[PDB]
Amino acid sequence: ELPEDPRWELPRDRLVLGKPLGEGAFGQVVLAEAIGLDKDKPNRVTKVAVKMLKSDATEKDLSDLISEMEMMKMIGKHKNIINLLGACTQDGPLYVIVEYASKGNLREYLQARRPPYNPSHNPEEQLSSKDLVSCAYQVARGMEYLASKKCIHRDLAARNVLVTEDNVMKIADFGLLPVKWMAPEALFDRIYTHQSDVWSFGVLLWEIFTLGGSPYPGVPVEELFKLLKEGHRMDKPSNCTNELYMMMRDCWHAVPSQRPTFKQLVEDLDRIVALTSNQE
Ligand SMILES: C=CC(=O)Nc1cccc(CN2C(=O)N(c3c(Cl)c(OC)cc(OC)c3Cl)Cc3cnc(NCCCCN(CC)CC)nc32)c1
Numbered sequence: 001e002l003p004e005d006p007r008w009e010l011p012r013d014r015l016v017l018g019k020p021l022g023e024g025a026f027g028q029v030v031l032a033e034a035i036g037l038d039k040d041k042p043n044r045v046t047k048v049a050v051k052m053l054k055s056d057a058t059e060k061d062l063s064d065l066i067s068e069m070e071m072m073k074m075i076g077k078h079k080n081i082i083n084l085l086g087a088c089t090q091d092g093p094l095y096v097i098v099e100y101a102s103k104g105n106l107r108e109y110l111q112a113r114r115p116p117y118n119p120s121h122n123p124e125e126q127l128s129s130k131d132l133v134s135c136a137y138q139v140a141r142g143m144e145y146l147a148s149k150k151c152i153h154r155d156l157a158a159r160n161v162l163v164t165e166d167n168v169m170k171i172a173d174f175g176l177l178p179v180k181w182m183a184p185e186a187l188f189d190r191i192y193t194h195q196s197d198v199w200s201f202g203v204l205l206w207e208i209f210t211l212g213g214s215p216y217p218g219v220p221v222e223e224l225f226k227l228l229k230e231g232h233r234m235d236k237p238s239n240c241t242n243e244l245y246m247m248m249r250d251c252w253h254a255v256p257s258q259r260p261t262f263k264q265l266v267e268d269l270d271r272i273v274a275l276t277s278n279q280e
Contacts, residue, residue, distance in 0.1 A: 002066070002089045008073065010034060010086040010097065017050065026064045026176075027053045034097060037085060048085055051096040062094070064176075069096045071175035075149050080142030081171045082162060101162035101170055106135070109163050110212035129280035130273065133244070136208050137269040138169035143201060144262040146174055147194045154192045156200035157181045158207040180215045184228050185256060195256035201265065202251025209240040243272065
């Protein structure tokens, strides 16, 4: 069986399992309430997300779940990633307990906040110019942290960033459609690096300032890798500054070594957030 780890072990009865949050590839996720997660305050209830194996699951799904958990232990804590909070490993089925993000993925969040095409049946308040740039900064901070711990994401996109109740951006699914976020060298040669994540961040920036737009709209998968070699880049979003468009373009450098780092992107975005007003 799985060995115990008392750094992360929470008893099974301390977890009140709630409604489904989504069905992942490795397993199913559910909303839950953890009693006495902070052992200093044992009478408190904390809303958490809980990952478990599906009904029709195999030995490969178990080892991938265990690998994700163990990877999350090593990477450590940061405000702008989904953090490991605990695990139930002993009594029966494996539960992996992580932070909960009540507002869902960044793409749907942004799409819902478009002016009333807005696909949501429940629209929300429009995001200011400073809010959009702040979102990019936080996502860059998370990636800066992940990169500093030698973690290569391999699928950074607005759909894999989650948003908390307090509107904190959190990188999701980092311890493991998609071709349009891949750098040419990842798409062609399967070479994933921190620089290929930087390319992906550029597509994520374009998602932010299109309020969750589909990149390369109407472009087939077969056409894209040719068009990227020819030097095609996405045009500036209608409601985007030239500075922020230049940042996307720098992320989309054909030569990987010429892309900025997340360290530098965080510094550039820090300056732009200060220079951007809330009145816009
Ligand atoms: C819009 C849906 C949406 O974004 N769904 C979604 C997207 C990605 C991931 C999930 C499921 N889930 C994980 O996989 N997460 C996750 C993550 Cl990101 C992870 O990467 C490090 C590792 C995990 O297990 C080890 C889990 Cl469970 C945690 C999580 C946190 N908050 C939510 N809120 C949905 C709260 C969504 C509730 N919505 C109403 C139906 C709000 C619009 N969902 C989480 C759901």
